[PDB]
Each structure stands twice: as C-alpha cells, then as structure tokens.
Amino acid sequence: SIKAMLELADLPASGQLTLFDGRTGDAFERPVTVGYMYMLKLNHLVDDKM
DNA sequence: GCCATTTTCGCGGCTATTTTTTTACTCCCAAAGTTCCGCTATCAGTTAGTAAAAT
C-alpha cells in the first residue's frame, strides 16, 4: 500500500531520493531515505536547565 | 555444655527539576512585674551672628 501510494504521487517506490551537498553541490554517492516525520518538542528545554 | 534454632540489627546507586499544612480547647480573682506615654533636664552638636584679621 505504501509503494502504491508513492507511485500515485509520482515518487520513487523505494522512498529514497538523490540528495546533493549544499556546501559543494556534489551528489551523495547513495540514495537517501527522505520523507516526513511527526516530531515533537518535549518539555526539556535548555533554558530551564542551564 | 555444646549444636541448633529463633530473634534482633542493619543494609539496600548518583546527579538534576517540579512543590508548605489541616482533630482534640473552663473560668475568675487577687497580686505582681512590666510597658508606654508624657515630662524633665543635661549635654553635645549645629547654626547664626559679630568682631578680628587680612587683603
């Protein structure tokens, strides 16, 4: 189902794209797993801990 | 009087960061020591005035 969803959106079925180094413009030698993750900001902030 | 069994005694990791708790209830009086306001009186400091000196 995930691969079918990727194919519908015109994206690689492996979920890996070709990325380039922004510092040099050179392509990384291998495809990189790029996607979207739900990330959280936990209540452990360096402001309250320093 | 030694061999085993029951009874105490003391122990169980280190750094951080958030936050109080809460039942239970005699009264009166006389005698004594202490405090709080007001006044006095003295001393020391401050300030105003005037003469002494210097420009």
mmCIF file of all heavy atoms in Angstrom, chain B residues 21-34:
data_model
loop_
_atom_site.group_PDB
_atom_site.id
_atom_site.type_symbol
_atom_site.label_atom_id
_atom_site.label_comp_id
_atom_site.label_asym_id
_atom_site.label_seq_id
_atom_site.Cartn_x
_atom_site.Cartn_y
_atom_site.Cartn_z
ATOM 1 P P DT B 21 2.705 20.421 52.240
ATOM 2 O OP1 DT B 21 3.576 19.228 52.159
ATOM 3 O OP2 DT B 21 1.413 20.439 51.519
ATOM 4 O "O5'" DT B 21 2.438 20.731 53.786
ATOM 5 C "C5'" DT B 21 1.547 19.913 54.536
ATOM 6 C "C4'" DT B 21 1.357 20.472 55.934
ATOM 7 O "O4'" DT B 21 0.984 21.870 55.846
ATOM 8 C "C3'" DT B 21 0.252 19.815 56.743
ATOM 9 O "O3'" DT B 21 0.530 19.938 58.134
ATOM 10 C "C2'" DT B 21 -0.968 20.635 56.341
ATOM 11 C "C1'" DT B 21 -0.374 22.035 56.217
ATOM 12 N N1 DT B 21 -1.042 22.873 55.182
ATOM 13 C C2 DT B 21 -1.830 23.930 55.576
ATOM 14 O O2 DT B 21 -2.015 24.227 56.742
ATOM 15 N N3 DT B 21 -2.397 24.634 54.547
ATOM 16 C C4 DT B 21 -2.258 24.392 53.192
ATOM 17 O O4 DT B 21 -2.810 25.083 52.342
ATOM 18 C C5 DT B 21 -1.419 23.269 52.849
ATOM 19 C C7 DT B 21 -1.193 22.907 51.410
ATOM 20 C C6 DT B 21 -0.859 22.572 53.849
ATOM 21 P P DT B 22 -0.341 19.120 59.209
ATOM 22 O OP1 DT B 22 0.401 19.128 60.488
ATOM 23 O OP2 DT B 22 -0.726 17.833 58.589
ATOM 24 O "O5'" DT B 22 -1.653 20.016 59.398
ATOM 25 C "C5'" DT B 22 -2.760 19.512 60.128
ATOM 26 C "C4'" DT B 22 -3.887 20.528 60.157
ATOM 27 O "O4'" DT B 22 -4.077 21.072 58.830
ATOM 28 C "C3'" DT B 22 -5.242 19.972 60.551
ATOM 29 O "O3'" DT B 22 -6.049 21.007 61.079
ATOM 30 C "C2'" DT B 22 -5.781 19.469 59.217
ATOM 31 C "C1'" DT B 22 -5.233 20.506 58.235
ATOM 32 N N1 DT B 22 -4.839 19.922 56.927
ATOM 33 C C2 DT B 22 -5.307 20.490 55.764
ATOM 34 O O2 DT B 22 -6.038 21.463 55.744
ATOM 35 N N3 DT B 22 -4.882 19.872 54.617
ATOM 36 C C4 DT B 22 -4.055 18.767 54.520
ATOM 37 O O4 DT B 22 -3.731 18.284 53.441
ATOM 38 C C5 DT B 22 -3.603 18.223 55.780
ATOM 39 C C7 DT B 22 -2.702 17.025 55.807
ATOM 40 C C6 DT B 22 -4.013 18.820 56.906
ATOM 41 P P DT B 23 -6.429 21.014 62.638
ATOM 42 O OP1 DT B 23 -6.663 22.418 63.042
ATOM 43 O OP2 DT B 23 -5.413 20.204 63.344
ATOM 44 O "O5'" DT B 23 -7.811 20.218 62.701
ATOM 45 C "C5'" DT B 23 -7.831 18.857 63.099
ATOM 46 C "C4'" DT B 23 -8.939 18.619 64.103
ATOM 47 O "O4'" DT B 23 -9.261 17.206 64.161
ATOM 48 C "C3'" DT B 23 -8.604 19.004 65.533
ATOM 49 O "O3'" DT B 23 -9.801 19.328 66.204
ATOM 50 C "C2'" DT B 23 -8.013 17.704 66.064
ATOM 51 C "C1'" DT B 23 -8.990 16.715 65.461
ATOM 52 N N1 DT B 23 -8.479 15.331 65.324
ATOM 53 C C2 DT B 23 -9.216 14.293 65.840
ATOM 54 O O2 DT B 23 -10.261 14.451 66.442
ATOM 55 N N3 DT B 23 -8.678 13.054 65.636
ATOM 56 C C4 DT B 23 -7.507 12.755 64.971
ATOM 57 O O4 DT B 23 -7.106 11.604 64.837
ATOM 58 C C5 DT B 23 -6.788 13.888 64.443
ATOM 59 C C7 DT B 23 -5.501 13.686 63.701
ATOM 60 C C6 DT B 23 -7.307 15.107 64.637
ATOM 61 P P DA B 24 -9.921 20.677 67.060
ATOM 62 O OP1 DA B 24 -11.178 21.343 66.662
ATOM 63 O OP2 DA B 24 -8.633 21.396 66.978
ATOM 64 O "O5'" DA B 24 -10.147 20.148 68.544
ATOM 65 C "C5'" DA B 24 -11.233 19.277 68.818
ATOM 66 C "C4'" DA B 24 -10.933 18.405 70.018
ATOM 67 O "O4'" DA B 24 -10.010 17.355 69.636
ATOM 68 C "C3'" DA B 24 -10.289 19.133 71.194
ATOM 69 O "O3'" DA B 24 -10.832 18.650 72.411
ATOM 70 C "C2'" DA B 24 -8.812 18.775 71.055
ATOM 71 C "C1'" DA B 24 -8.897 17.364 70.498
ATOM 72 N N9 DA B 24 -7.722 16.968 69.732
ATOM 73 C C8 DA B 24 -6.755 17.788 69.222
ATOM 74 N N7 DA B 24 -5.814 17.151 68.569
ATOM 75 C C5 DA B 24 -6.189 15.822 68.658
ATOM 76 C C6 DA B 24 -5.607 14.637 68.171
ATOM 77 N N6 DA B 24 -4.471 14.611 67.466
ATOM 78 N N1 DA B 24 -6.238 13.475 68.438
ATOM 79 C C2 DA B 24 -7.373 13.506 69.145
ATOM 80 N N3 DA B 24 -8.014 14.555 69.655
ATOM 81 C C4 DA B 24 -7.363 15.693 69.373
ATOM 82 P P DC B 25 -12.054 19.422 73.109
ATOM 83 O OP1 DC B 25 -12.578 18.553 74.185
ATOM 84 O OP2 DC B 25 -12.960 19.903 72.043
ATOM 85 O "O5'" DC B 25 -11.369 20.704 73.767
ATOM 86 C "C5'" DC B 25 -10.411 20.541 74.799
ATOM 87 C "C4'" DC B 25 -9.912 21.886 75.293
ATOM 88 O "O4'" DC B 25 -9.206 22.564 74.229
ATOM 89 C "C3'" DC B 25 -10.997 22.845 75.763
ATOM 90 O "O3'" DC B 25 -10.522 23.617 76.853
ATOM 91 C "C2'" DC B 25 -11.260 23.707 74.530
ATOM 92 C "C1'" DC B 25 -9.897 23.734 73.841
ATOM 93 N N1 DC B 25 -9.985 23.743 72.352
ATOM 94 C C2 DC B 25 -8.828 23.947 71.592
ATOM 95 O O2 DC B 25 -7.749 24.122 72.170
ATOM 96 N N3 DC B 25 -8.925 23.948 70.239
ATOM 97 C C4 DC B 25 -10.107 23.753 69.653
ATOM 98 N N4 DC B 25 -10.152 23.764 68.317
ATOM 99 C C5 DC B 25 -11.296 23.542 70.411
ATOM 100 C C6 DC B 25 -11.189 23.543 71.744
ATOM 101 P P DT B 26 -10.735 23.105 78.360
ATOM 102 O OP1 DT B 26 -9.670 23.719 79.179
ATOM 103 O OP2 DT B 26 -10.887 21.634 78.335
ATOM 104 O "O5'" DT B 26 -12.126 23.756 78.802
ATOM 105 C "C5'" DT B 26 -12.253 25.165 78.857
ATOM 106 C "C4'" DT B 26 -13.549 25.577 79.528
ATOM 107 O "O4'" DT B 26 -13.535 25.158 80.914
ATOM 108 C "C3'" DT B 26 -13.769 27.069 79.590
ATOM 109 O "O3'" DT B 26 -15.142 27.339 79.771
ATOM 110 C "C2'" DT B 26 -12.960 27.438 80.826
ATOM 111 C "C1'" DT B 26 -13.283 26.275 81.752
ATOM 112 N N1 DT B 26 -12.171 25.913 82.651
ATOM 113 C C2 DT B 26 -12.323 26.018 84.015
ATOM 114 O O2 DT B 26 -13.341 26.420 84.547
ATOM 115 N N3 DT B 26 -11.222 25.635 84.739
ATOM 116 C C4 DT B 26 -10.023 25.167 84.241
ATOM 117 O O4 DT B 26 -9.089 24.847 84.965
ATOM 118 C C5 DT B 26 -9.947 25.083 82.807
ATOM 119 C C7 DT B 26 -8.702 24.596 82.145
ATOM 120 C C6 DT B 26 -11.009 25.452 82.097
ATOM 121 P P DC B 27 -15.745 28.757 79.332
ATOM 122 O OP1 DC B 27 -17.119 28.541 78.829
ATOM 123 O OP2 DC B 27 -14.733 29.412 78.475
ATOM 124 O "O5'" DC B 27 -15.808 29.577 80.698
ATOM 125 C "C5'" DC B 27 -14.711 30.377 81.083
ATOM 126 C "C4'" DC B 27 -14.758 30.682 82.562
ATOM 127 O "O4'" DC B 27 -13.889 29.775 83.273
ATOM 128 C "C3'" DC B 27 -14.304 32.092 82.922
ATOM 129 O "O3'" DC B 27 -15.344 32.769 83.590
ATOM 130 C "C2'" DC B 27 -13.075 31.893 83.819
ATOM 131 C "C1'" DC B 27 -13.231 30.462 84.306
ATOM 132 N N1 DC B 27 -11.932 29.774 84.557
ATOM 133 C C2 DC B 27 -11.504 29.534 85.870
ATOM 134 O O2 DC B 27 -12.210 29.907 86.813
ATOM 135 N N3 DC B 27 -10.321 28.898 86.066
ATOM 136 C C4 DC B 27 -9.591 28.513 85.019
ATOM 137 N N4 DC B 27 -8.432 27.890 85.254
ATOM 138 C C5 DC B 27 -10.014 28.747 83.681
ATOM 139 C C6 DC B 27 -11.178 29.373 83.500
ATOM 140 P P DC B 28 -15.391 34.370 83.592
ATOM 141 O OP1 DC B 28 -16.802 34.784 83.433
ATOM 142 O OP2 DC B 28 -14.371 34.853 82.637
ATOM 143 O "O5'" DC B 28 -14.910 34.739 85.064
ATOM 144 C "C5'" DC B 28 -15.329 33.936 86.147
ATOM 145 C "C4'" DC B 28 -14.539 34.262 87.392
ATOM 146 O "O4'" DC B 28 -13.404 33.374 87.500
ATOM 147 C "C3'" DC B 28 -13.989 35.683 87.448
ATOM 148 O "O3'" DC B 28 -14.374 36.285 88.672
ATOM 149 C "C2'" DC B 28 -12.470 35.497 87.348
ATOM 150 C "C1'" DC B 28 -12.282 34.102 87.919
ATOM 151 N N1 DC B 28 -11.079 33.401 87.409
ATOM 152 C C2 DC B 28 -10.175 32.827 88.307
ATOM 153 O O2 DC B 28 -10.386 32.929 89.521
ATOM 154 N N3 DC B 28 -9.093 32.176 87.818
ATOM 155 C C4 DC B 28 -8.906 32.091 86.502
ATOM 156 N N4 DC B 28 -7.828 31.441 86.061
ATOM 157 C C5 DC B 28 -9.818 32.665 85.576
ATOM 158 C C6 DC B 28 -10.881 33.302 86.069
ATOM 159 P P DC B 29 -14.184 37.859 88.908
ATOM 160 O OP1 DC B 29 -15.476 38.398 89.380
ATOM 161 O OP2 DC B 29 -13.542 38.449 87.717
ATOM 162 O "O5'" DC B 29 -13.136 37.914 90.105
ATOM 163 C "C5'" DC B 29 -13.073 36.840 91.028
ATOM 164 C "C4'" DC B 29 -11.792 36.907 91.829
ATOM 165 O "O4'" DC B 29 -10.791 36.036 91.234
ATOM 166 C "C3'" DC B 29 -11.163 38.293 91.891
ATOM 167 O "O3'" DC B 29 -10.686 38.539 93.195
ATOM 168 C "C2'" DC B 29 -10.021 38.198 90.882
ATOM 169 C "C1'" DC B 29 -9.592 36.755 91.055
ATOM 170 N N1 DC B 29 -8.871 36.191 89.870
ATOM 171 C C2 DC B 29 -7.744 35.378 90.056
ATOM 172 O O2 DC B 29 -7.357 35.139 91.201
ATOM 173 N N3 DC B 29 -7.109 34.877 88.971
ATOM 174 C C4 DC B 29 -7.560 35.159 87.750
ATOM 175 N N4 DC B 29 -6.907 34.642 86.704
ATOM 176 C C5 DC B 29 -8.704 35.982 87.543
ATOM 177 C C6 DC B 29 -9.320 36.472 88.620
ATOM 178 P P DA B 30 -10.744 40.017 93.815
ATOM 179 O OP1 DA B 30 -11.909 40.077 94.721
ATOM 180 O OP2 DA B 30 -10.631 40.985 92.705
ATOM 181 O "O5'" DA B 30 -9.405 40.102 94.679
ATOM 182 C "C5'" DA B 30 -9.024 39.000 95.483
ATOM 183 C "C4'" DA B 30 -7.528 38.757 95.402
ATOM 184 O "O4'" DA B 30 -7.182 38.218 94.103
ATOM 185 C "C3'" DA B 30 -6.654 39.995 95.596
ATOM 186 O "O3'" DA B 30 -5.577 39.674 96.447
ATOM 187 C "C2'" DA B 30 -6.176 40.310 94.178
ATOM 188 C "C1'" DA B 30 -6.073 38.918 93.590
ATOM 189 N N9 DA B 30 -6.148 38.882 92.136
ATOM 190 C C8 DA B 30 -7.061 39.508 91.345
ATOM 191 N N7 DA B 30 -6.897 39.279 90.066
ATOM 192 C C5 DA B 30 -5.798 38.444 90.018
ATOM 193 C C6 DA B 30 -5.112 37.841 88.950
ATOM 194 N N6 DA B 30 -5.457 38.001 87.671
ATOM 195 N N1 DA B 30 -4.055 37.065 89.248
ATOM 196 C C2 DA B 30 -3.711 36.909 90.528
ATOM 197 N N3 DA B 30 -4.280 37.421 91.614
ATOM 198 C C4 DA B 30 -5.327 38.187 91.286
ATOM 199 P P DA B 31 -4.730 40.835 97.154
ATOM 200 O OP1 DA B 31 -4.728 40.558 98.605
ATOM 201 O OP2 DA B 31 -5.225 42.132 96.647
ATOM 202 O "O5'" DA B 31 -3.256 40.612 96.590
ATOM 203 C "C5'" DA B 31 -2.695 39.309 96.597
ATOM 204 C "C4'" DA B 31 -1.516 39.226 95.647
ATOM 205 O "O4'" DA B 31 -1.992 39.139 94.281
ATOM 206 C "C3'" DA B 31 -0.564 40.420 95.695
ATOM 207 O "O3'" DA B 31 0.768 39.951 95.753
ATOM 208 C "C2'" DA B 31 -0.851 41.158 94.387
ATOM 209 C "C1'" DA B 31 -1.246 40.014 93.475
ATOM 210 N N9 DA B 31 -2.077 40.420 92.348
ATOM 211 C C8 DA B 31 -3.167 41.237 92.381
ATOM 212 N N7 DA B 31 -3.725 41.422 91.210
ATOM 213 C C5 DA B 31 -2.947 40.670 90.350
ATOM 214 C C6 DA B 31 -3.016 40.443 88.964
ATOM 215 N N6 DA B 31 -3.947 40.983 88.176
ATOM 216 N N1 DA B 31 -2.087 39.640 88.418
ATOM 217 C C2 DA B 31 -1.157 39.101 89.208
ATOM 218 N N3 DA B 31 -0.990 39.239 90.519
ATOM 219 C C4 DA B 31 -1.929 40.045 91.034
ATOM 220 P P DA B 32 1.976 40.955 96.074
ATOM 221 O OP1 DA B 32 2.745 40.366 97.190
ATOM 222 O OP2 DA B 32 1.434 42.326 96.192
ATOM 223 O "O5'" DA B 32 2.864 40.897 94.751
ATOM 224 C "C5'" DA B 32 3.096 39.648 94.113
ATOM 225 C "C4'" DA B 32 3.650 39.857 92.721
ATOM 226 O "O4'" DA B 32 2.568 40.149 91.805
ATOM 227 C "C3'" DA B 32 4.638 41.019 92.594
ATOM 228 O "O3'" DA B 32 5.808 40.576 91.942
ATOM 229 C "C2'" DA B 32 3.881 42.052 91.755
ATOM 230 C "C1'" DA B 32 2.981 41.159 90.926
ATOM 231 N N9 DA B 32 1.798 41.832 90.402
ATOM 232 C C8 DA B 32 0.913 42.603 91.094
ATOM 233 N N7 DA B 32 -0.060 43.080 90.356
ATOM 234 C C5 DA B 32 0.208 42.586 89.094
ATOM 235 C C6 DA B 32 -0.450 42.726 87.860
ATOM 236 N N6 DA B 32 -1.566 43.442 87.701
ATOM 237 N N1 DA B 32 0.081 42.102 86.793
ATOM 238 C C2 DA B 32 1.198 41.388 86.956
ATOM 239 N N3 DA B 32 1.904 41.180 88.063
ATOM 240 C C4 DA B 32 1.349 41.813 89.106
ATOM 241 P P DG B 33 7.187 41.378 92.120
ATOM 242 O OP1 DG B 33 8.121 40.502 92.860
ATOM 243 O OP2 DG B 33 6.875 42.728 92.634
ATOM 244 O "O5'" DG B 33 7.708 41.546 90.622
ATOM 245 C "C5'" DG B 33 7.585 40.469 89.716
ATOM 246 C "C4'" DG B 33 7.316 40.973 88.312
ATOM 247 O "O4'" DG B 33 6.002 41.568 88.248
ATOM 248 C "C3'" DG B 33 8.291 42.036 87.804
ATOM 249 O "O3'" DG B 33 8.853 41.604 86.582
ATOM 250 C "C2'" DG B 33 7.420 43.289 87.625
ATOM 251 C "C1'" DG B 33 6.050 42.681 87.399
ATOM 252 N N9 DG B 33 4.937 43.560 87.740
ATOM 253 C C8 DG B 33 4.695 44.168 88.947
ATOM 254 N N7 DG B 33 3.604 44.882 88.960
ATOM 255 C C5 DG B 33 3.087 44.728 87.683
ATOM 256 C C6 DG B 33 1.917 45.265 87.104
ATOM 257 O O6 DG B 33 1.076 46.011 87.620
ATOM 258 N N1 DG B 33 1.762 44.857 85.784
ATOM 259 C C2 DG B 33 2.627 44.032 85.110
ATOM 260 N N2 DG B 33 2.315 43.754 83.838
ATOM 261 N N3 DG B 33 3.729 43.522 85.641
ATOM 262 C C4 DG B 33 3.893 43.912 86.925
ATOM 263 P P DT B 34 9.996 42.462 85.854
ATOM 264 O OP1 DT B 34 10.979 41.504 85.307
ATOM 265 O OP2 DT B 34 10.444 43.530 86.772
ATOM 266 O "O5'" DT B 34 9.221 43.140 84.636
ATOM 267 C "C5'" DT B 34 8.453 42.331 83.769
ATOM 268 C "C4'" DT B 34 7.622 43.180 82.830
ATOM 269 O "O4'" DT B 34 6.573 43.851 83.570
ATOM 270 C "C3'" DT B 34 8.393 44.277 82.096
ATOM 271 O "O3'" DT B 34 8.167 44.163 80.706
ATOM 272 C "C2'" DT B 34 7.808 45.576 82.658
ATOM 273 C "C1'" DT B 34 6.412 45.140 83.043
ATOM 274 N N1 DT B 34 5.775 45.998 84.078
ATOM 275 C C2 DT B 34 4.531 46.527 83.837
ATOM 276 O O2 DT B 34 3.910 46.330 82.810
ATOM 277 N N3 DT B 34 4.029 47.293 84.853
ATOM 278 C C4 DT B 34 4.634 47.578 86.057
ATOM 279 O O4 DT B 34 4.103 48.282 86.907
ATOM 280 C C5 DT B 34 5.938 46.995 86.244
ATOM 281 C C7 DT B 34 6.696 47.239 87.514
ATOM 282 C C6 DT B 34 6.439 46.240 85.257
#
